[PDB]
Amino acid sequence: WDYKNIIEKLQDIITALEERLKPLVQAELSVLVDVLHWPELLFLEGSEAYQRCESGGFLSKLIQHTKDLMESEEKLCIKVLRTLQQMLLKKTKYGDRGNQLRKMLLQNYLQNRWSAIAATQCRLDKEGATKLVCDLITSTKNEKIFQESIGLAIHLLDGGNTEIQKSFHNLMMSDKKSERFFKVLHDRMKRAQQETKSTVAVNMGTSVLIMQPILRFLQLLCENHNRDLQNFLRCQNNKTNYNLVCETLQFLDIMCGSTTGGLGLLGLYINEDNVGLVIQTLETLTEYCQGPCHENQTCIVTHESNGIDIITALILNDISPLCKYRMDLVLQLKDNASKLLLALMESRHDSENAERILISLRPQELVDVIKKAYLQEEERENSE
């Protein structure tokens, strides 16, 4: 017997089977989402189980059990959170074979019985998804569970759902543990800032990678210029208040190198890996200030960290290292910075913000930047 040849052929067959069955695996996993959507179809109409399933009792019980099993079985909690996130996602195609398998499975199980996303989000919120997310974020000590909770929050709030925002605000206000929620968020923000500062001093860490989902969640809270959420993120009216707008500005300032970055060394600090996080931070600040929220604008403009200078430098500076290789990201960064600066002066008749911005954003350099951007069109490459 050819031992080596037999092993090699077995490995080749394993690889081929793994490659072949991937769409089928995806379709089979997807069918679970449909089953969870309409459990009552498994039972007979008019039965007690049918009544329990139809009214959403199954989903509410699942959410309650997920809350209960946070400490008993972390893996099961992660699996259920991922399943909920998949339930909140848009439909996808898995090829001809995948679609055939999915249709066959749906027929076998269920005999013949953005608007959809919004309806699903509202249904999950009714079943208590928002409360589950808040409880998990406040109480969980597991990094994976926290990540899944933040992802579920983002999926629930995706697209700027007013009902989900109202539910979040009601939970933050009425509930007595909102203080712990904001304290946890503030502590994670501070840890990310400290890690980024240490890395910058040395010269990308889970504590820094987690900032992207947190910033996205905070932006989604304030989406569509939600004044209540915009003001709450600055002051919570609790015994101790955590200003997340100020912390976001501080994170942006530390990421870009602080005063040294503003002087003109911004290019070194910003690179391909961390550019997306800076873009997300700029978008979050813009969502904070737009609507407008005058208090947030004043907080950002008059901050002691002088983070407005960072934004002006972002607009003026060329980002020499990154721009040579990826000019599209630099253009996106400049566009986001300009949007943030515009939002900082949305409906301010006084000149305070304008003068503060002009202190660091000199007119000649701004005009030169505008002219260079206009002339760069002939050198533009195919990009969004």
Partner 1 sequence: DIVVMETKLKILEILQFILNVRLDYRISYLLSVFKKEFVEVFPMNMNLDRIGEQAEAMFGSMLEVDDEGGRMFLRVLIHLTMHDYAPLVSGALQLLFKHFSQRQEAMHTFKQVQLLISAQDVENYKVIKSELDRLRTMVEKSELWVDSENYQIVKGILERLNKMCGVGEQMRKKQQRLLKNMDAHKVMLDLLQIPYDKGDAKMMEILRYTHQFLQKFCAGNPGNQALLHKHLHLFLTPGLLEAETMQHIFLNNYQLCSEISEPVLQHFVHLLATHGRHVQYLDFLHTVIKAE
Residue ranges for the known binding site for Ca(2+) are 223, 287
Select from 37-45, 216-224, 244-252, 284-292 the region that touches partner 1 (CB under 8 A): 37-45
Query: Terminus-to-terminus CA distance in the chain, angstroms?
Result: 59
Please, which residue, 65 or 103, has the CB nearer to partner 1?
65
Select from 28-36, 135-143, 159-167, 345-353 the region that touches partner 1 (CB under 8 A): 28-36
What residue numbers does the annotated binding site for ATP cover?
A: 337
Distance of alpha carbon 335 from alpha carbon 341, whole angstroms: 10
Taking the mean position of all CA atoms in its chain, how far away is CA 211?
Answer: 9
Rounded to a whole number of angstroms, the minimum distance from the CB of residue 128 to partner 1 is 16
Q: Is the dihedral of CA 373, 379, 383, 384 positive or negative?
A: positive
Q: Are 309 and 355 in contact (CB under 8 A)?
A: no
Distance of alpha carbon 147 from alpha carbon 137, whole angstroms: 9
By CB under 8 A, name the one of 70, 80, 329, 344 that touches partner 1: 80
Please, which residue, 66 or 296, has the CB nearer to partner 1?
66
| Under rule CB under 8 A, residue 342 binds partner 1 | no
Q: Which of residues 40-79 bind partner 1 (CB under 8 A)?
A: 42-43, 49, 52-53, 57-58, 61-62, 65, 68-69, 72-73, 76, 79
Distance of alpha carbon 126 from alpha carbon 167, whole angstroms: 9
What residue numbers does the annotated binding site cover?
A: 223, 287, 337
Q: Which of residues 347-376 bind partner 1 (CB under 8 A)?
A: none
Select from 38-46, 139-147, 208-216, 272-280 the region that touches partner 1 (CB under 8 A): 38-46
By CB under 8 A, name the one of 18, 45, 328, 355 that touches partner 1: 18
Select from 24-32, 136-144, 184-192, 344-352 the region that touches partner 1 (CB under 8 A): 24-32
| Under rule CB under 8 A, residue 25 binds partner 1 | yes
Please, which residue, 32 or 122, has the CB nearer to partner 1?
32
Q: DSSP per residue over 72-89, as a string? A: T-HHHHHHHHHHHHHHTS
Size of the site for partner 1 (CB under 8 A): 44
Site track for partner 1 across 165-204, x = CB under 8 A: ----------------------------------------
Tally of CB atoms within 10 A around 46: 7
Please, which residue, 107 or 320, has the CB nearer to partner 1?
107
Q: Omega into 292 within 30° of 0, i.e. cis?
A: yes
Please, which residue, 18 or 187, has the CB nearer to partner 1?
18
Secondary structure of 227-266 in HEC code, one letter for each residue: HHHHHHCCCCCCCCCCCHHHHHHHHHHHHCCCHHHHHHHH
Nearest alpha-carbon partner for 309 in 369, 358, 352, 373: 358
Please, which residue, 129 or 343, has the CB nearer to partner 1?
129
Distance of alpha carbon 43 from alpha carbon 64, whole angstroms: 22
Q: Provide the residue type at 26 as one letter.
A: Q
Distance of alpha carbon 138 from alpha carbon 185, whole angstroms: 9
| Under rule CB under 8 A, residue 29 binds partner 1 | yes
Site track for partner 1 across 92-121, x = CB under 8 A: ----------------xx------------
Q: Provide the residue type at 160 as one letter.
A: G
Q: Are 227 and 288 in contact (CB under 8 A)?
A: no
Select from 9-17, 129-137, 142-150, 225-233 the region that touches partner 1 (CB under 8 A): 9-17
Rounded to a whole number of angstroms, the minimum distance from the CB of residue 44 to partner 1 is 9
Distance of alpha carbon 372 from alpha carbon 203, whole angstroms: 31
Nearest alpha-carbon partner for 153 in 169, 139, 140, 164: 164
Return left, alpha or beta for 256; rule: phi > 0 is left, psi -120 to 50 is alpha, else beta: alpha
Report the interface residues with partner 1, using CB under 8 A: 1-3, 5-7, 9-10, 12-14, 16-18, 20-21, 24-25, 28-29, 31-32, 35, 39, 42-43, 49, 52-53, 57-58, 61-62, 65, 68-69, 72-73, 76, 79-80, 83, 108-109
